[PDB]
Every structure is written in structure tokens, then in C-alpha cells.
């Protein structure tokens, strides 16, 4: 890999500089290089990896949705035929998006998940696995669509089972997991009632545990609780 000659600590330092500069493709390449050194990641380093790739795939998803909308309109009744270019360019952005998701899934499988023994690291990585299968499912249309959806579901379910046994209901990893699994049910699995039930239960169990928290922990947990409430407002 092109980062193989750079020290681990220098890759982490440069990932933080790239974040300040809003250079998220660079940030992701630096963090990929750090993972490939083979050592486990600290909490802060896990968050740098996820922020970098979220920003890269987020720009690809936004572009894909614009292009897919134009393509679908061109397939309506009365729309002028304009040739293969819209489909070709949507396909180009799709293939790039798939490549990024495959890169993240490959880092998780070789070897981040198998070396993660503490609940906080294991749940974080299994959540990420569910998220990147979810982004693959948003663009999937062929023979493997069902299997891609089931891979997202299976990763999120294993993460949920560990989080319920090992973490309090206010823990920010547990809350963000439940938030994103609820989005999976609503947007991917055609299961809006499951989405609303999960978001409601998660919100109520977190509310009842806030009394145990410091001011700083309370701020972290209530920020995510607000996102659950905002989705419930959109979905009901």
C-alpha cells in the first residue's frame, strides 16, 4: 500500500490535519494505512476511521441520489430519449461507492473484528459492518440484493445482542447502533413498525438512565436521543 513506508503515529497525526483541512479522501487513506499496521485501534482512532469514510461515502451517496432521480425521470412517459449517458455516469458513481464500501468491509474482516474482544470495540466494528452493507443495499438491484440486506441485518443483530448484555442504555455506541438499525428497518427492510418500536424503546430506556450520568456524559447521550426523536417525528 502507498502508506506502507509511513510510521503509524505520523499517519494518525496526518489524519487529524486532513480533518481540519476538510480533506476527507486523504483522511481515509491515512486511516487505512494506520489499520494496515496490524495493531488494534484506540477509541479516538476508531472515531477517526469512521468519520473519514462517512464523509467520503456520504458525498458519493448524495451524488448517486441526484443521478438516480434524473435517470428515473428520463424513464417516465413523455420524457425525451437522451442516450446512454445518464445511466453510464450513475453506474460510474455507483461502482466507485461500491469500491469504498468493499474497502471498509475488507478492513473489518482483515482483521479488526476478530481481534476486538472488549464490548466497546467489538460493537463499534459490527455497527460499521452493518452500516457499509446498508450503503451497498441502497444501490443493489440484482441477484444478491437479498443476501446484502441479510448481511447488514446479521451484523446489526450481533452488535445489538452484545450491547444489551454489556453496556448501559445511555452508552453512545449503543444509542448510535440502535439509531442506525432503526433506519435500516425503515429505509431498507420495508419494516416501518419495527423501526418505530426500536426507536421508541431505545429512547425511553435511555431517558430512565440519564440520572446516573455526569453533565458531560448527559450531553453526549441526549444529542443522540434527539436524533431518535427527530426520526420518530418524520416517521409518525
Amino acid at each position: 500500500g502507498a502508506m506502507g513506508s509511513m510510521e503509524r503515529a505520523s499517519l494518525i497525526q496526518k489524519a487529524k490535519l486532513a480533518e481540519q483541512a476538510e480533506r476527507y479522501e486523504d483522511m481515509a487513506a491515512f486511516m487505512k494505512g494506520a489499520v494496515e499496521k496490524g495493531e488494534e485501534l484506540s477509541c479516538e482512532e476508531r472515531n477517526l476511521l469512521s468519520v473519514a469514510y462517512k464523509n467520503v461515502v456520504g458525498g458519493q451517496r448524495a451524488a448517486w441520489r441526484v443521478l438516480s432521480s434524473i435517470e428515473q425521470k428520463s424513464n417516465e412517459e413523455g420524457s425525451e430519449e437522451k442516450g446512454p449517458e445518464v445511466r453510464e455516469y450513475r453506474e460510474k458513481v455507483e461502482t466507485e461507492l461500491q469500491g469504498v464500501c468493499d474497502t471498509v468491509l475488507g478492513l473489518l474482516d482483515s482483521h479488526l473484528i476478530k481481534e476486538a474482544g472488549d464490548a466497546e470495540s467489538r460493537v463499534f466494528y459490527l455497527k460499521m459492518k452493518g452500516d457499509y452493507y446498508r450503503y451497498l443495499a441502497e444501490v443493489a438491484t440484482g441477484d444478491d440484493k437479498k443476501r446484502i440486506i441479510d448481511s447488514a441485518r446479521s451484523a446489526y443483530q450481533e452488535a445489538m445482542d452484545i450491547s444489551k448484555k454489556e453496556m448501559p442504555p445511555t452508552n453512545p455506541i449503543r444509542l448510535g447502533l440502535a439509531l442506525n438499525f432503526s433506519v435500516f428497518h425503515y429505509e431498507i427492510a420495508n419494516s416501518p413498525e419495527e423501526a418505530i418500536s426500536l426507536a421508541k424503546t431505545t429512547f425511553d430506556e435511555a431517558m430512565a438512565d440519564l440520572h446516573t450520568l455526569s453533565e458531560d456524559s448527559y450531553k453526549d447521550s441526549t444529542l443522540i436521543m434527539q436524533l431518535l426523536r427527530d426520526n420518530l417525528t418524520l416517521w409518525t
Binding site: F124, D131, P172, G176, N180, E187, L234
Partner: peptide, 10 residues
Amino acid sequence: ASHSMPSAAC
């Protein structure tokens, strides 16, 4: 339009 989260406060 739905909200999701990639990070987890340390």
C-alpha cells in the same frame, strides 16, 4: 432525510 450516526463519544 433520516438521521444516522458514525461516531461514538469517548
